[PDB]
Each structure stands twice: as C-alpha cells, then as structure tokens.
C-alpha cells in the first residue's frame, strides 16, 4: 500500500560531481528506509540501510540523509565505478515492502548530435514475409530523443544501447513494421526523427523509383 | 567466497508449474531470513515472497495464492514453488538474504535467475565512409552476440537490445561502419544451433 | 448467516474533529445537528446518531 | 561604531542543499565573531563562536569560516530543523557590540502564484465613517509581493503569514484604510498587485458596498 | 535543568519607570557575566547593557544615561531598571549569559520578555468554492489566537498578524474557505475580557 517517489528517471553529472538522489515516501515511515545500487551488468547491492547507517565496504563518498517522508542519498565525488542505477525501499510495513521506480546516473558531456542514417530492407526480407523499415540514430548524448514513424509522410518499439565510454553517447534504433512485402506498396516511408540541437526531421523518407 | 546459487529459471507455458532453487554458502544459513525479489525487463525491483527463520511464509498481493516459498535448514537449500504463471510474471528473480536487525534489508544478493512465461518456441532467425546494418527478425533469447565479416569483424559492431514481437520472438537491428571512399553480416544462434548470414552495401 | 441482517452491526459517520487513536465512543443518543437539535430527539435535520 | 553586513535577508534552498551565509565586517576584527540561530517561534541560540569553534550540541553540518573582514557560515546538508533566521555579531569592540540585520532560510520549491481575492466587510464597519477594503493574496511561494492601493483607480500596512509546513507558500493580506468622510466621498477603489506569474495586475477595481 | 527566567515585561507610559527581572538556575550564577539584548518587532538583535562578575556595568550609546542594570550575587537575581522610556524603545528583551573565554558571546539564552511603551489602552475590537473572512479593527496585543467556529472547523483557516494603528491599537484579518458550488469567526479577545464574533455566510 505504501508507495515511494524517487528522483527523476535519469540524473546527468560528470566525474567528481555532487549528486543528491532524492526519494520521498507517501507517508511517515521514520527511518525504515534503505537504498540499493544495481549496475545493469551485475546483481544489485545495498549502500545505505536504515537511512543513517553505512554498509561495510561502501566508500566514504556515499552518504544517506532524510527521514520520515523525504529521503536524500547524497554522493560527494562521482567515480567511474559509481555510475549505476539506484533504488529506495521503504521498510515501515514489512510484508508489503515496495521499491522506487529507479534513478539513472549518467556521465555528463556536451550535446552530441546523432548521425541520422536510414537503410532499406534487403531483398531477403522482401523474399521473406512481413517487411520492415529501420531508422538509426547513432552516437548522441541527449538520450531523451525519441523516434516515431509515419506512412507516406504499425510502429515498432525502438532500441537503445548503453552509453559507450569511448564517446559518452547513446545509440538508438527504431523500426517500422508492415505487412507482407509492403515496401513496394508505398513510395514514401517517413521516419520521424526528433533530437535536441538537431533539425528533427518529422518525415525522413526514401525516394523509390 | 560468500555467494548465493540459483537454478531452475527458464521458459514455461502459461500456468505451468515451475520450481526455483537457491543455495547459500559461506555463512550460517539457519540464522538468516531469505527474500525473493523479481525485476521485470526495463522495470525496477519488486518483492515477491520471503520466509523467516521460524518457517513462516509471506507473499505479495499479486503473488499470494499461486506461489509457495519453502526452505530447508540443512544443505543450505532454498526453493520457491511457482504455479499459475502468466505473461505478466516475466521478470528476473534474485535470491536475497535478510540481514540481521529489526527491519527487512537485503545485505546479500545472489546471481539472479531469469524466468520467462510464453507459449512460443525457438525459431531460426533470418538476416536482412558509410554506416549500414542488417535487420534481424524472428529471434530468440540467446547467449551469444552478432558479428560481421562472417564472424571476423567485431570491433566496430553495435548490437541493439532485442524487442518482443507478437509471435513470441525477438528482433535485432545491429549496424556496422564500412569504408566507402559490404561485408557479410553473420548472426549466430546457440539455442537454434544454426548460423544465418547476409550482407548489405552502402 | 443472516439474510435479513439490518441490525447487530453499526458504525459511526460523524465527529471527524479530533478522533484520537484507540478512543472509542458509545454515546449516540443525540448530538448537535442542524439549526435546532430537535429539542433532544431524533428526526429530520437531526440525524446525528450513527 | 563597528558595522556588520550580512547576506541578503532571505535565502531559498531545499533539503540537503549547501548554504553559505556570508557576513562581512566594516574593518578587520580578526576572529572576534560569533553566529546565532533564532527560530521566530522561540528564543535565539548560538551555533558558532569565535568563527572557528562549534558550539556543543550543534550538529556537525554547520561550519563557520572566514576571518578579519569577511565571514561565511557554511551549511552542508539542510534539515527541517535548520530553516530559521541567523545573525552575525562582532566581538572586537566589546562594549559597542553590533549585530547583523539577519538572514532568513526558506524552503525552495516551484514559484507559486497568489490567488488574488477581494471581498468587502460587513455593514458594521460601513456604519462608521472609517470603512475598509481588504485585498487577499493567499498561497504563493515567494514573499516579496509588493501590494499598494489606488483611490478612484488610502494605503495601509499589509500582513504576511509564515511559510506553510506542507505547501511551503506564503499568504499576504493588504487592507485599504479610509479616514473620515473618505468612505462617503470616494466610491471606486483599486487594489494594486505586483508579483511574479501574473500579467501585471497593477489595477484591480472594486466598488463600495 | 539549566534555564533563565524572566518577568516584568508589560505596557508602560512614555517616560515611566520600569524594572525587569531575570532569574538563573542550573549553574554557578556568581561566576558568569550577564547581558541584555533587545529585538524590535521585525528588526534584529540589539545589545542593550551588561554587567560583569566584578559588578561593573556597561551600556550602549542610546542606552546609557537612562538605563540602570543591577545584579545580586545571591538568589541568582538579575535586574534591569529603566527610566525615561519612549515609543522607540518597544522591543523584545532577552536575558543572556556570558560564557567562559576572552570574548563576549551568549552561550545561554532566557525565555525572553516583551516590553511595549505607549500611552494607549485596551479597547474592544469590532469584527466585520469561495474564500472570504472577517475583518477586525481597533484590536490590542493579545495572548490567544483567533479561531473559526471555536476551532472545530477542519477547513482552510488562516490568521494574519496584526497591524499598527494611529491611536496605538491594532487590526487583525482572517480568511476561511466555504463551499459555494457560513461559519462563525470567533474573536476571543482575552485582555478585553469580552468575546466578539461575526458570520460570513453567502
């Protein structure tokens, strides 16, 4: 029954910056709250338990604060090993324990525009069943971008990779789903691009013969 | 080192019986409580069930009535009987231990197991300066990655996470960069035990 | 097992001023309601009982 | 003779934020300076004495810094019990001791807008020649709401309540005071409102009841 | 415990004699210096006078010449006699103790007392989804707050601090929320020993 409201979905900061992960409760829970750290490549691990105590093995740069209805996980100096996902859990009512929606910690850098590319399906997909048209946004830091699809100026879920440490940017891929060999059914297939600091072409289409 | 084992998670028909297993090592297992927490793909952690030292069991609202957690004091064995599964229960389950104190906190975590509920089966996928990519359709959860140049090109290759399809299958949109001042994109599939490849040119 | 029921179970629906925890109340004869509390009886404009 | 110049009268910050209350002196006073905390609901209390020594019983989040001509009271993590008024005092010239003008610590949130309402009083005041007209500004986050009065499109002292513990907003009340024969001579009145978020409500006409 | 008492604050005619009192408890009063600091309504702290352990007295620039501070080593009794008060002397006085060391700092504070210098007197005030309220005129410094419907109302109730009047009186304003898709404002003036109320029904 008790619900938790954590910080926004993502927090952007550079190395050594100070991040205060805020997480509020739906009611007074006192100090029955604990935090966790989960890297997407491994199992989760706790950092602060009881909102005042520090777990053994955690560096002193982490610090827990807040009580009652508002809790704040304050980090002093961000290290490359600290960038991960965090969650807050309430422990006032033991059986119905709930967790926060999560908070992402990403490395801050300049606004990198994506290399917007689009490729048509090969002849193999046309010989096969339902064809598809894919759109590509590669190497961009503002992950808040999102790609849609339009027909002649059945959308599918987009896919985003992790932040590559080589450029501290993200890569996004979105595709449009159609019926059997519908690539010859229309002359225009519009990819809807939208990115910060970019022209954001609402209809990026091919030009068939 | 102190760690928690896990096994039994896998594909299962909707509503079919399923039994999970967890094995502790490196500490007195009889004096610590155990908890079961799941995590849906793209979602956060969610407590499922737990069992205390005295053998009492507890479950969640959407969990009670179909789950059954069991634990044996000997052999450090922990189990979680699951029945009546549905598509909404697909999540990654983690075996966790309850630390000593007065409130429930997870001080030790296991490797975690994956449980997927679907009626589909494994199906062979088809493969479909400039940058291009090969579209993949009809995929399946696999322990391998995508490659290029028939498996020889893996440095400049990017593989996006898969997305679920209506037929109970996945799809991939891996891309690569080739000089254009053209190579065979090869897709290996371990559960299918069959390799498929194609190529695209600028 | 009472298909008729209609009694032997009651609950209060007023006095939300303080309501301290674990403080019950049994007096439900008459209470201040409306312009005039019906001279101390129940009826219209004085439905103070639970 | 020695004068003190403290930080602005009000400082806005949220829980866990870092606040550095700056207070400068008219000349070099060395380290003969002390800080005090005063909640408007109780008596004052000292926090830092000698600008380097922490008072016993004060949490370690408070820290005093600066010497000679510039002093800075640095707070690491704000708590609900930390939001109060602070004063700096010099101790170099002990008989002519002087205190700072004060600095208020308020909770930071979104910029709320005052719900401007106006209503006339009963005829009990209209029976007397000295009528009045009130102009209400309730539930707004800032406090610097400048309100005046315009006759036919006199002014009086306004009133502001403390910041709410849940809404974190202030409420303002201004009244129009009319002297003898002014209630019967002038019929049209106007409340002058100036606050962030509104479309310059310099005139809010009103008719005598 | 350790605390400082205070008494003697009240209304006095301009230029009349006044004597405040402060009583310490919980420490050796004969070995610590005492200070007097006032605070005008809306203003900051202002040091008035002090007395050392050796009985020496000190005053401020605008304080010397009309004030007289005294202190007894026994009974922990501290006094502050004032003469020739004016309207500008209205402020909240505090009893403070001088801590150990080589510089003046207030390590202990008292309860604080209010002193008002004016020739006025207590006079009975007159009281006069939507949001409205009652207006009070000709008020006086009061020890109890204004409530709506004897405080039993759970709706939005607010009360603004009083404002100064030309004749030395005050004026208070209160607002309330009523349904407009009716309550009685209770102004219980304690120093006047008379209660007045009004209604704001639509």
From Swiss-Prot, chain C:
Region (Disordered): 13-48
Biological function: Attaches the virion to the cell membrane by interacting with host receptor, initiating the infection. The major receptor is host ACE2. When S2/S2' has been cleaved, binding to the receptor triggers direct fusion at the cell membrane. When S2/S2' has not been cleaved, binding to the receptor results in internalization of the virus by endocytosis using host TFRC and GRM2 and leading to fusion of the virion membrane with the host endosomal membrane. Alternatively, may use NRP1/NRP2 and integrin as entry receptors.
Effect of residue 10 to R: In strain: Delta/B.1.617.2, Epsilon/B.1.427/B.1.429, Kappa/B.1.617.1, Lambda/C.37, 19B/501Y, Omicron/BA.4, Omicron/BA.5, Omicron/BQ.1.1; Contributes to cellular immunity evasion and increases infectivity
Region (Immunodominant HLA epitope recognized by the CD8+): 6-14
Region (Receptor-binding motif): 1-50
Protein name listed in UniProt: Spike protein S1
Subunit structure: Binds to host ACE2. RBD also interacts with the N-linked glycan on 'Asn-90' of ACE2. Cleavage of S generates a polybasic C-terminal sequence on S1 that binds to host Neuropilin-1 (NRP1) and Neuropilin-2 (NRP2) receptors. Interacts with host integrin alpha-5/beta-1 (ITGA5:ITGB1) and with ACE2 in complex with integrin alpha-5/beta-1 (ITGA5:ITGB1). May interact via cytoplasmic c-terminus with M protein. May interact (via N-terminus) with host bilirubin and biliverdin, thereby preventing antibody binding to the SARS-CoV-2 spike NTD via an allosteric mechanism.
Section of the entire sequence shown: 443 to 492 of 1273
Disulfide bond sites: 38-46
Species of the source: Severe acute respiratory syndrome coronavirus 2 (2019-nCoV)
